[PDB]
Amino acid sequence: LPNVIINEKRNIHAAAHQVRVLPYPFTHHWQFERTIQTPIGSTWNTQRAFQKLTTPKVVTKPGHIINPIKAEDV
Amino acid sequence: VLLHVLFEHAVGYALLALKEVEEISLLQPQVEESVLNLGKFHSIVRLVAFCPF
Amino acid sequence: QDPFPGPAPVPVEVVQKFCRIDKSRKLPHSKAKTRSRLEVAEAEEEETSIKAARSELLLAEEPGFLEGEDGEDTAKICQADIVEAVDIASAAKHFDLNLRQFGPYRLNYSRTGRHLAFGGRRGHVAALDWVTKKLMCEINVMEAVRDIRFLHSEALLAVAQNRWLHIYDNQGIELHCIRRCDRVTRLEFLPFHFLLATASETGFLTYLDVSVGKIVAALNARAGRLDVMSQNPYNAVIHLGHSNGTVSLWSPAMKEPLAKILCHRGGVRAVAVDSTGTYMATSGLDHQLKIFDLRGTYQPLSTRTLPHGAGHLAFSQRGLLVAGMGDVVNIWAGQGKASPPSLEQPYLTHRLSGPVHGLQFCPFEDVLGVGHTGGITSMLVPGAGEPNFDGLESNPYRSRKQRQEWEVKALLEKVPAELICLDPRALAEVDVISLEQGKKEQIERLSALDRFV
Amino acid sequence: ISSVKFNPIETFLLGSCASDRNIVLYDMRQATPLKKVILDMRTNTICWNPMEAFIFTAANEDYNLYTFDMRALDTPVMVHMDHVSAVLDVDYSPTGKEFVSASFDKSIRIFPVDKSRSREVYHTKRMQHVICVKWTSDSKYIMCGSDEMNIRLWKANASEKLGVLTSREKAAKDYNQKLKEKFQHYPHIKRIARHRHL
RNA sequence: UGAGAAAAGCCUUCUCUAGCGAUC
């Protein structure tokens, strides 16, 4: 930078909110950073894009008895 | 919990089908709205047959 | 035998706009457990971007335009020629209020383009809907007024009086008199943080949280009198102009400026940045208009010498730049597709009754607001306003119930002051220095007589 | 022999626990035991996974829970270490992804099958020495039996709304769940989420 | 109690219920 001076001091208050550890199963911090980039709210995505992003993993009917698996539905 | 209910009225007999319901907590302050509110009641109950007199 | 078998394609440029991954990174991964997560992340990103590409057809409006014929220059085209050639709806938006008995006026548009508030030097304060010709309030504080700004919705407005800072309702009822902020010259509001920034004559920059009502920061610039101030909407940082020729970047967390950029050989008197946060426009006493690239380079992209001095600068949502020199305003236009505005030749010109004291573009309309000694004028600027607005963020045609639902959502979503940095995505990157501190703790737990000498 | 359990999948199999700190697998059709594995301490109760035929969880007295694959019984799949007293009873959800354990200390915990730490813990002054816990059949409630002559009912999720929901309520609930797992590694999120008063 | 007290006409901000909407 020809005439620009950049403050090299770190913002400690902002650094408190950042993630300290590198989560499993990630070896490099570049790998973990990629997953968090995509936003998920309905403000930034269409309604059908929002629905596929918020798909629940387990769906249960409220009143039906759940039986164990039986030979791939026999 | 899918089952059929037979309701007898002065006008005739009605057969209805129940899709789903929270059975254990039904007699509780929050879940009771499921049957009280007409819109929520239509969600879980349908009229499959009606035979008037 | 189907001539075109494949599904409908989507434009690559449009998809690239709805993209937030860094493909340039060449990280190596040799583990399948790492690989499965990465491919899903790309799969999630690609499908969301495709859906937004199809939604481009849902957009219904088109930006305005103005091009001459038979070699005529658009600079010499006057406002009267435009008004007769445009529909009756837009023609009603051009008007010239004449209030010379009071001093020169400073004007501010609300974030929604429906409402306008202005303040006079002699102390005339009025707020009005400007689309319809109705007056919300019109009061005369006995003390002098230097600046006027809106606070989030149109309900609250802040005036920078001679002694202290005052807060008023949209109907003219005085609410707060803030004595900490004294001799304030300039006011400007950060919308998504609910912070109001004040520049004072004594040289102090103060941040006030309007949501809670407490002062979060008070910083001493140590640069003398402060009179030139602006914010970057993308960056949320505050720009300060000084007589040295340097512009300082400020955040509420730090007690020292983020960066200093030398831009002029003399004192700087104006600064403005675009909505995207890419380009920076400054003017100075050396009669030079400069455009800087804020995306890591900080070099002057364009330079032009001016006969008079550009007191004020502003940027629209489509990238048009207007400079106010004395009693004459000049607008420079460029294609704007990944390019700065072209300073080769201006787009439109207009002469005011008096010297210019304030400029701002209406958010979602093709009009320009000018405040001067004679009064307030509204120009017609075809192609300056962004056509398609979002109904859930800033709806001009919103009811009272819609407005109050939005305000709670914004209050639930307020950003803390300390998160402001030069990078709005700084929260995403892993704290590298905190990594190695953790790794250190992890490691911790895991010839014959020469012998007689 | 303390307990015996039939396997809900391939229903001819059996599991057993005895007083020599061993677990014995039987076979009803061929009328012979299959294999024996000895641990450090006695296992109080055994429970079969209702969605995985070859997986079972043993409640052991060394403050721990052991998840086993019966084909490869040399080493346990996972170890659960959040209890501080002898574990008495366990039971699986029919979804097969979680189980609830009773212990000698006056608390009950819920563990994910793939995690080694408990998701939540329930406690009360009036409840002492939980003897038995059974997970209800619709994956929504917890019932526990204690020695103070009372049986208590608990909720599977402490913040779910049981009644019929509208479209906006369901959309909001799904958005909240995806938000929590997206930002699960941030320190402030971890600080609030993992705090259980004891 | 002490922007005294009392009465009329206009805007601003907001509170309660009651139907109605969730059945594809």
mmCIF file of C-alpha atoms in Angstrom, chain D residues 2-115:
data_model
loop_
_atom_site.group_PDB
_atom_site.id
_atom_site.type_symbol
_atom_site.label_atom_id
_atom_site.label_comp_id
_atom_site.label_asym_id
_atom_site.label_seq_id
_atom_site.Cartn_x
_atom_site.Cartn_y
_atom_site.Cartn_z
ATOM 1 C CA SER D 2 -30.354 -61.235 36.174
ATOM 2 C CA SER D 3 -32.177 -60.453 32.915
ATOM 3 C CA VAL D 4 -33.055 -62.000 29.555
ATOM 4 C CA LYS D 5 -34.264 -60.168 26.444
ATOM 5 C CA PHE D 6 -35.658 -61.314 23.111
ATOM 6 C CA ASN D 7 -34.397 -59.568 19.988
ATOM 7 C CA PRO D 8 -37.202 -57.770 18.087
ATOM 8 C CA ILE D 9 -35.449 -58.466 14.748
ATOM 9 C CA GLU D 10 -34.521 -62.066 13.938
ATOM 10 C CA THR D 11 -36.680 -62.942 16.926
ATOM 11 C CA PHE D 12 -34.970 -66.299 17.593
ATOM 12 C CA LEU D 13 -32.019 -64.566 19.308
ATOM 13 C CA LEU D 14 -31.564 -63.930 23.031
ATOM 14 C CA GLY D 15 -29.384 -61.858 25.319
ATOM 15 C CA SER D 16 -28.475 -62.506 28.925
ATOM 16 C CA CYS D 17 -26.495 -61.149 31.876
ATOM 17 C CA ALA D 18 -25.204 -63.223 34.801
ATOM 18 C CA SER D 19 -23.317 -62.836 38.085
ATOM 19 C CA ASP D 20 -19.839 -63.594 36.662
ATOM 20 C CA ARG D 21 -19.816 -60.171 34.912
ATOM 21 C CA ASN D 22 -20.466 -61.820 31.544
ATOM 22 C CA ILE D 23 -22.967 -61.436 28.705
ATOM 23 C CA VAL D 24 -24.268 -64.591 27.015
ATOM 24 C CA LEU D 25 -25.983 -64.783 23.624
ATOM 25 C CA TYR D 26 -28.345 -67.679 22.928
ATOM 26 C CA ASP D 27 -30.178 -69.113 19.921
ATOM 27 C CA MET D 28 -33.701 -70.468 20.364
ATOM 28 C CA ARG D 29 -33.981 -72.418 17.098
ATOM 29 C CA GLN D 30 -30.717 -74.358 17.426
ATOM 30 C CA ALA D 31 -31.178 -74.696 21.223
ATOM 31 C CA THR D 32 -27.639 -73.626 22.154
ATOM 32 C CA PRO D 33 -25.854 -70.532 23.469
ATOM 33 C CA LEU D 34 -23.764 -68.593 20.959
ATOM 34 C CA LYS D 35 -20.959 -66.652 22.648
ATOM 35 C CA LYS D 36 -19.782 -65.178 25.949
ATOM 36 C CA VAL D 37 -18.020 -61.888 26.724
ATOM 37 C CA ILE D 38 -16.710 -60.900 30.169
ATOM 38 C CA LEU D 39 -16.353 -57.270 31.280
ATOM 39 C CA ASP D 40 -14.828 -55.645 34.358
ATOM 40 C CA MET D 41 -18.080 -55.449 36.354
ATOM 41 C CA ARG D 42 -21.593 -56.876 36.237
ATOM 42 C CA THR D 43 -24.111 -55.642 33.673
ATOM 43 C CA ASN D 44 -27.497 -54.862 35.211
ATOM 44 C CA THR D 45 -29.691 -54.828 32.100
ATOM 45 C CA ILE D 46 -29.445 -55.417 28.347
ATOM 46 C CA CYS D 47 -31.515 -53.771 25.612
ATOM 47 C CA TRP D 48 -31.745 -54.499 21.888
ATOM 48 C CA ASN D 49 -31.685 -51.810 19.210
ATOM 49 C CA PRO D 50 -35.129 -51.842 17.520
ATOM 50 C CA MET D 51 -33.759 -50.636 14.162
ATOM 51 C CA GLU D 52 -30.384 -52.455 14.080
ATOM 52 C CA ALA D 53 -30.571 -56.208 14.636
ATOM 53 C CA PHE D 54 -26.916 -56.730 15.615
ATOM 54 C CA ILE D 55 -26.571 -53.838 18.104
ATOM 55 C CA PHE D 56 -27.346 -53.904 21.821
ATOM 56 C CA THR D 57 -26.542 -51.706 24.817
ATOM 57 C CA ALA D 58 -25.548 -53.047 28.238
ATOM 58 C CA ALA D 59 -25.983 -51.116 31.489
ATOM 59 C CA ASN D 60 -22.838 -51.834 33.515
ATOM 60 C CA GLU D 61 -21.970 -51.006 37.118
ATOM 61 C CA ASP D 62 -18.721 -49.160 36.304
ATOM 62 C CA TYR D 63 -20.652 -45.884 35.887
ATOM 63 C CA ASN D 64 -20.684 -46.530 32.133
ATOM 64 C CA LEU D 65 -22.775 -47.723 29.195
ATOM 65 C CA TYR D 66 -21.433 -50.094 26.540
ATOM 66 C CA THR D 67 -22.781 -50.400 22.994
ATOM 67 C CA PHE D 68 -21.826 -53.666 21.305
ATOM 68 C CA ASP D 69 -21.933 -55.264 17.872
ATOM 69 C CA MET D 70 -22.597 -58.936 18.530
ATOM 70 C CA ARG D 71 -20.784 -60.083 15.379
ATOM 71 C CA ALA D 72 -17.524 -58.493 16.607
ATOM 72 C CA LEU D 73 -17.773 -58.732 20.395
ATOM 73 C CA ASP D 74 -14.055 -58.218 21.099
ATOM 74 C CA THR D 75 -14.479 -54.453 21.539
ATOM 75 C CA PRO D 76 -17.502 -52.232 22.232
ATOM 76 C CA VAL D 77 -18.635 -49.750 19.605
ATOM 77 C CA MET D 78 -18.963 -46.782 21.971
ATOM 78 C CA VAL D 79 -18.682 -45.925 25.672
ATOM 79 C CA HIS D 80 -20.941 -43.514 27.571
ATOM 80 C CA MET D 81 -19.429 -41.859 30.628
ATOM 81 C CA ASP D 82 -21.775 -39.195 32.057
ATOM 82 C CA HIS D 83 -23.088 -41.182 35.038
ATOM 83 C CA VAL D 84 -21.602 -41.085 38.539
ATOM 84 C CA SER D 85 -23.332 -44.129 40.079
ATOM 85 C CA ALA D 86 -24.333 -47.658 39.115
ATOM 86 C CA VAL D 87 -26.470 -47.797 35.971
ATOM 87 C CA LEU D 88 -29.616 -49.874 36.482
ATOM 88 C CA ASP D 89 -31.851 -49.816 33.387
ATOM 89 C CA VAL D 90 -31.766 -48.716 29.740
ATOM 90 C CA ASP D 91 -34.300 -48.530 26.911
ATOM 91 C CA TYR D 92 -34.196 -47.526 23.240
ATOM 92 C CA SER D 93 -36.376 -45.197 21.244
ATOM 93 C CA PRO D 94 -38.180 -46.952 18.357
ATOM 94 C CA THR D 95 -36.365 -44.507 16.063
ATOM 95 C CA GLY D 96 -33.190 -46.345 17.096
ATOM 96 C CA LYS D 97 -31.078 -43.189 17.422
ATOM 97 C CA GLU D 98 -31.234 -42.558 21.192
ATOM 98 C CA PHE D 99 -31.649 -44.383 24.487
ATOM 99 C CA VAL D 100 -32.446 -43.410 28.077
ATOM 100 C CA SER D 101 -30.649 -44.840 31.110
ATOM 101 C CA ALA D 102 -31.509 -45.178 34.797
ATOM 102 C CA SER D 103 -28.782 -45.071 37.433
ATOM 103 C CA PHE D 104 -28.379 -45.397 41.189
ATOM 104 C CA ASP D 105 -27.885 -41.649 41.582
ATOM 105 C CA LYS D 106 -31.117 -39.668 41.365
ATOM 106 C CA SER D 107 -30.999 -38.755 37.682
ATOM 107 C CA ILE D 108 -31.776 -40.119 34.221
ATOM 108 C CA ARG D 109 -29.848 -39.309 31.044
ATOM 109 C CA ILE D 110 -30.455 -39.524 27.296
ATOM 110 C CA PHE D 111 -27.539 -40.562 25.094
ATOM 111 C CA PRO D 112 -27.180 -40.506 21.311
ATOM 112 C CA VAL D 113 -25.973 -43.837 19.958
ATOM 113 C CA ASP D 114 -23.038 -42.307 18.061
ATOM 114 C CA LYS D 115 -22.055 -39.798 20.764
#
